[PDB]
């Protein structure tokens, strides 16, 4: 992520010129920075895009070795017959994938050049390489990513200091605003305008809104002023941390709960950088003990559920290619919206979990494309079906499922569909019953060892 992110300068940031030579003259005078967004005649460009034009990636990386430009600076490079406007770091990342797969044309289509490489983008790259190349070439690509990621993280200069937990300027103003509103509420209660419960509920709502304002102020300050902050970079790239934990380090701790479940009226207004008081530390310890007890006293229920599932599905095996049935199920693409009383499209992730790698029971005609009966649905097929549904052409998809399978002591190949670990039809003889029990039980046990104590696992056990 560090080498794929580009720099943004704010020195010039808006100056307009007439000719590129005029813009270059101002750069040497110290008025406009290299990456400051400027407009030459009609288009927005930068000094680096005009000053440095490289014929090939070899020349661009050679200049980096001599120290003229950095990996994060945006320049103009000529690659694969295209005059791209990218940083040397993103050009370097493209060469890593090309050499790992030993094919320049395919690797060019597998990557997203114009974005920094986060956890989500890297997961898509691995999945697409598996589909096009196979296990052997995907394993080689995985090692190449590991080798370069370790190398660049060592020399980049990532470290944690006490000043890296930047306190926003808006925290002081937000707290003073809350105090003025808090005193207004108490005056109204003293005059009989509201009861005890109404006053208690208003105080909790005020502190909930104030906490969320501080969270927005923390991350907005990082984006505008410190885009390369170690804490900000870790959360944005998905390496470590979530916004809730960042707020406790830089903003305020927030509201706490009593052992009985009630919440204290007064929240903890200090962060971990400033340091807690003795009274605040003791109050926060009630919830820490509660979370530890839930972890220890609920891992047995989740483990007990897994054993029940194994003993009920351990005999289900793929025993034949086709059972010859004509029954099927219809997977909906729309759901009722009870709050608004209307039919709306479902989430893309929910549709994928019920359609990916499934055999079509009937022929479907969508957007001029014929999907024949008996066709396994790939991820591209699911995306085409979602696009057709958005155009009002189809509402449901008939598929074969284990629910309607007629095979004795198991299921057939056509009713099961894909082997999700290989993205191909399942081979005859697989113990799909054990896989199903382990797939269901694993997330429940992992989550309770780290919400799930609410109507989660208890709700699942009841169902």
């Amino acid at each position: 992520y560090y080498i794929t992110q580009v720099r943004k300068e704010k020195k010039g940031a808006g100056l307009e010129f007439a000719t590129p030579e005029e813009a270059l003259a101002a750069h040497e005078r110290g008025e406009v920075a290299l990456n400051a967004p400027i407009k030459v005649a009609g288009r927005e460009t930068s000094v680096g895009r005009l000053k440095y034009v490289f014929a090939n990636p070899d020349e661009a990386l050679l200049a980096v070795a001599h120290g003229i430009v950095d990996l994060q600076d945006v320049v103009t490079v000529r690659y694969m017959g295209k005059r791209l406007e990218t940083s040397p770091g993103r050009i370097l990342f493209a060469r890593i994938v090309a050499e790992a797969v030993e094919d320049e044309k395919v690797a060019w289509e597998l990557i997203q050049l114009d974005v920094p490489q986060e956890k989500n983008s890297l997961k898509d790259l691995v999945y697409q390489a598996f589909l096009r190349l196979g296990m052997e070439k995907t394993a080689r690509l995985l090692d190449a990513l590991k080798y370069y990621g370790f190398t660049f993280s060592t020399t980049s200069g990532i470290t944690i200091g006490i000043d890296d937990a930047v306190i926003p300027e808006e925290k002081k103003q937000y707290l003073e605003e809350a105090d003025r509103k808090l005193l207004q509420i108490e005056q109204a209660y003293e005059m009989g305008f509201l009861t005890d419960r109404e006053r208690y509920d208003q105080i909790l709502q005020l502190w909930t809104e104030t906490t969320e304002k501080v969270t927005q102020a923390v991350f907005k300050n990082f984006e505008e002023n410190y885009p390369f902050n170690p804490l900000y970079v870790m959360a944005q790239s998905g390496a470590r941390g979530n916004p809730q934990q960042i707020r406790q380090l830089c903003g305020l701790r927030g509201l706490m709960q009593k052992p009985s479940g009630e919440t204290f009226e007064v929240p903890v207004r200090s962060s971990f950088r400033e340091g807690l008081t003795v009274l605040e530390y003791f109050i926060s310890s009630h919830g820490a003990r509660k979370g530890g007890a839930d972890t220890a006293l609920r891992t047995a229920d989740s483990g007990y559920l897994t054993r029940k599932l194994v003993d009920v599905t351990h005999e289900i095996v793929v025993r034949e290619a086709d059972c010859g049935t004509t029954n099927y199920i219809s997977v909906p693409l729309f759901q009722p919206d009870e709050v608004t009383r209307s039919l709306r499209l479902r989430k893309r992730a929910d549709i994928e979990a019920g359609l990916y790698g499934r055999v079509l029971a009937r022929e479907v005609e969508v957007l001029g494309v014929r999907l024949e009966e008996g066709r396994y649905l790939s991820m591209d097929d699911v995306h085409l079906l979602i696009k057709a549904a958005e155009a009002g052409e189809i509402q449901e998809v008939p598929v074969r499922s284990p629910l309607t399978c007629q095979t004795r002591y198991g299921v057939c190949q056509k009713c099961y569909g894909y082997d999700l670990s290989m993205a191909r039809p399942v081979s005859i003889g697989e113990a799909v019953g054990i896989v199903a029990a382990q797939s269901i039980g694993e997330p429940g046990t992992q989550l309770t060892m780290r919400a799930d104590i609410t109507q989660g696992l208890p709700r699942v056990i009841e169902l």
């Binding site: 196979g134 296990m135 052997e136 394993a139 081979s427 005859i428 003889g429 697989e430």
Partner: protein, 94 residues
């Protein structure tokens, strides 16, 4: 990853059939001391030792490389079981 694993998986209808074919072929090679191999002298797997370069003793490695060549025939109800072993012994004494 095993060399040619993608091509090996495409030669069988079920992934568990490939394992059976490899395991049975490895037993045949060990039984006859690698004298029944279909590999050329320059195709035999080798391992590096301090004394020198010698033949690979791992029979599973030999069987996987033999399957990629395409000189082996596999299937069900090919030949009678008794006729197979007696013929192999007569061709390859051990």
């Amino acid at each position: 990853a095993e060399p040619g694993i993608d091509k090996l998986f495409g030669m069988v209808d079920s992934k568990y059939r490939l394992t059976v074919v490899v395991a049975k072929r490895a037993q045949q090679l060990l039984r006859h001391g690698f004298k029944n191999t279909v590999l050329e002298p320059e195709e035999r797997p080798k391992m590096q030792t301090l004394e020198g370069l010698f033949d690979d003793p791992n029979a599973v490695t030999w069987a996987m490389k033999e399957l990629l060549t395409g000189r082996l025939v596999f299937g069900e109800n090919l030949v009678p079981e008794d006729r197979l072993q007696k013929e192999m012994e007569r061709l390859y004494p051990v």
